[model samples]
Target: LHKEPATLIKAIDGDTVKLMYKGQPMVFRLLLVDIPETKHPKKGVEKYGPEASAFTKKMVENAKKIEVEFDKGQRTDKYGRGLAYIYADGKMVNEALVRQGLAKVAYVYKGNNTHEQLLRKAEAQAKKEKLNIWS
Candidate 1:
């Protein structure tokens, strides 16, 4: 995994974001998680999409620090967005979204399964609590 300091420029949606890394703007898709589509050209808005996006934006805004960690197995998604695990302060942003029921564990990429079980556990907890999207 390659980690780099980043400043979130914008949350494109819940799972996708624009960031400045070393003064260069880049797009990153949060790995191992999926959130509702707020602005899909074809699909329109999915349930809880806006809320998820808002939640992500607030989380990024309130974070004391942010970093992007690239998975060695996959550097980018098919859309060419960089694939990464985002950290806010010391907490994993991906896990936080899942735990809060704003997102779900979607693609558990190989070699980057370190947080797979924990993420799934968080998803289950959110489901049990009927939080946000889970509701």
Candidate 2:
């Protein structure tokens, strides 16, 4: 368990986020999945895009304890920053975003792959129920 200083800045749609950790600006690609971008290509942002950002901001801003859980595979992305499964208040933030349908699973490298199935199940449920940010 590694501790760091992190400040949530803004929501990059639903799944991705821009934050400041240890005075270093960073982009956090929510582990597991991604959400629509609202504009641009590859499916515009969804209903709760902003709402998800708000939720994230509320959870992360001015936070003192920021912890990360690393997978058995890759440690950092191409950007040279550590890619990890993040947690707040003992809850898995990445999985939470996916479970709430605010984001979609990336599954880019099939690295950790612990919560892949869980995220898929959440997406299915969100699609079926037409949950927030899904419209």
Candidate 3:
């Protein structure tokens, strides 16, 4: 009952990505979060960096469709990519990273919080199990 777009290329990281639908590029962001760097970072990357990237890439790759959901904020971030929660096969890819203990909820924007509570719950579960990268 909704019009969703398909992915063209794979999502590489937090900074760079391009999705294709019907042969057109639909740029998108992971939304309100950042994972540990997979590649080497200047001050050293966080734990599970490679695992995080692999988790994200595996989730985004080979996906036929992605559902776009927005919150109570601008549609685009400073870089101009549409700020959205990407859903693949009814799963929130953005939150999935956190649910898997691969990422942390780095930022919280005020507004439509339908997913925030769930995300927090997931985070708490991960923390309780000592799944955080700090472990």
Candidate 4:
């Protein structure tokens, strides 16, 4: 439940972000959400990739204050990126992205996260409502 303040450097993609935290630059991979990738060198861009990246770009650009919360189960991905939940002001951008259908709840094996169920709920609601990706 500890949130460390951060400065957004840029939105790398829908699910990846860069920020300055603790006087160090870090790449944060949004935990529990798999948004379409626009900048994957190997995977190539997928459908709705731009929109998802755009949504994250706007979100980070408009955020007055940003904070990052590390997950209880995992801290870093195999790619050496930190796995965290992003908060724009007080809103959890991770969940918001899922709620809006920009992402799907994925990579659940890490577990032990407090908001795991919350994120899945948002995903289910998005699918039930036929949101962008769900539709």
Candidate 5:
């Protein structure tokens, strides 16, 4: 994974964020972890979606340093959003959410498996403990 510095504009949700990287504004759809949809037009509200959004918002909002790590896979999706891992104050926001049981490992595609073990481990522990969504 290649990591770069980014300035967060907003946390669109637990799994999506708006940021500035290399002086360009971007919308990122986080890789590996999927948070419930909070404001998706089609999906509508999902259970624990609001909590997931708020958790991400708080983490990113309070972060003094933010970073993005890209996998050596598909960069952008059909919607033109980046696929990346977010770091807030040196913590992996994606992994944190999964460990908290607020998110789950998902979207496993070819070449985009940089942190597969890391994400999968967290999800397994959360499920084993029956945390939040896992419960």
Candidate 6:
């Protein structure tokens, strides 16, 4: 995986964020996690979308530090957004989102199979708890 230190500049939605990577503006789509869409021209607002976005905003804004880790393969999505795992305040933000039931595991990358499993486990726990979207 490729790793970089970054500062979260903005949370565009539940699953997307803007960051400063080496002083350059960059956008990242959370790897292996898909939160409901808060804004989509075609789909409009979805259930739990706002809550997911709020949860992500709180996590990123409250973090003391942020780092982005990209899978070695297929680092970018078709929209040119970097696909990555975000770490904030010493916690894996992507996993945290799933664990808290704000997001669901999706789009597994072959290069990051191990992380996929972990994320799935978090999703399972969220399901068991019937939290947020799962509820």
lDDT for each residue of candidate 4 in 1-135, tens digit (9 for 90 to 100): 689999999889888899998999999988888888888778769888888889888888899999999878878878889888999988998899999998998867476477889999999999999999999
Supply the global lDDT for candidate 2.
0.63
Query: lDDT of candidate 5?
Result: 0.91
Q: Per-residue alpha-carbon lDDT of model 5 for 24-82, expressed as tens digits? A: 99999889888889977777699999999999999999999999998899988899999
Best by lDDT: 5
lDDT of 6 by residue, 56-105 (tens): 88999999999998876787878889888898877888998999999989
lDDT tens per residue, model 3, 16-98? 35677557776776665667775455847556777877776776675666666767676676666766677777788878887
User: Per-candidate TM vs. native?
Assistant: 0.89, 0.65, 0.78, 0.93, 0.95, 0.92
Two-way lDDT contest, 4 vs 5, winner: 5
Candidate of highest TM-score = 5
Quote the positional error of residue 81 for candidate 5 in Å. 0.4
Summing lDDT over every window of 10 consecutive residues in candidate 6, give the lowest-scoring window.
106-115
Better of 4 and 6 by lDDT: 4
Winner by TM-score between candidate 4 and candidate 2: 4
Query: Looking at model 5, which ten-residue stretch has the lowest summed lDDT?
Result: 35-44
Rank all candidate structures by their TM-score, best first, as comma-separated numbers: 5, 4, 6, 1, 3, 2
lDDT of 5 at 104: 89
Q: Of the candidates numbered 3 and 4, which has the greater lDDT value?
A: 4
For candidate 3, the 10 contiguous residues with the lowest summed lDDT are 1-10
Q: Is candidate 4 or candidate 6 better by TM-score?
A: 4
